[PDB]
Amino acid sequence: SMEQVAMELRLTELTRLLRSVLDQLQDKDPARIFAQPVSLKEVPDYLDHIKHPMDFATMRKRLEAQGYKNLHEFEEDFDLIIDNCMKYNARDTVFYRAAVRLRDQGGVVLRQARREVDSIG
């Protein structure tokens, strides 16, 4: 149907805008602390602590399969990256601090992305 095509074009354009958002958020992580999944070889207890691991590569796979239907879904996964790190790592650690900085800086980007998603539809 033509309606199904039009919905698919909206999903494609959302995907475009989320790819740009993802690039911008990832730049706020120059140390690359959040680039890849936490290794279960190197942190064998991780899944005892963290039930829903997340990282930028995993988000990028979901994005490229057009697996985010709305901004809320995408923000949920970003929040898991931050929140998981802030639970597993203590306040005095480079990891925790990196997550705080990513959250603070990412907030700016996400605030305007919400306006753009509402605005363009």
Curated annotation (Swiss-Prot):
This protein's name: Bromodomain-containing protein 1
Function: Scaffold subunit of various histone acetyltransferase (HAT) complexes, such as the MOZ/MORF and HBO1 complexes, that acts as a regulator of hematopoiesis. Plays a key role in HBO1 complex by directing KAT7/HBO1 specificity towards histone H3 'Lys-14' acetylation (H3K14ac), thereby promoting erythroid differentiation.
Residues covered by the Bromo domain: 9-113
The protein's assembly and partners: Component of some HBO1 complex composed of KAT7/HBO1, MEAF6, ING4 and BRD1/BRPF2. Component of the MOZ/MORF complex composed at least of ING5, KAT6A, KAT6B, MEAF6 and one of BRPF1, BRD1/BRPF2 and BRPF3. Interacts (via PHD-type zinc finger domain) with unmodified histone H3. Interacts (via PWWP domain) with dimethylated and trimethylated 'Lys-79' on histone H3.
Transmembrane segments: none
Disulfide-bond pairs as recorded: none
Portion held of the full protein: 555 to 674 of 1058
Domain of life the protein comes from: Eukaryota
Places the protein is found: Nucleus; Chromosome
Source organism per UniProt: Homo sapiens (Human)
Tissues/organs with expression: Highly expressed in testis.
Crosslinked positions (Glycyl lysine isopeptide (Lys-Gly) (interchain with G-Cter in SUMO2)): K41
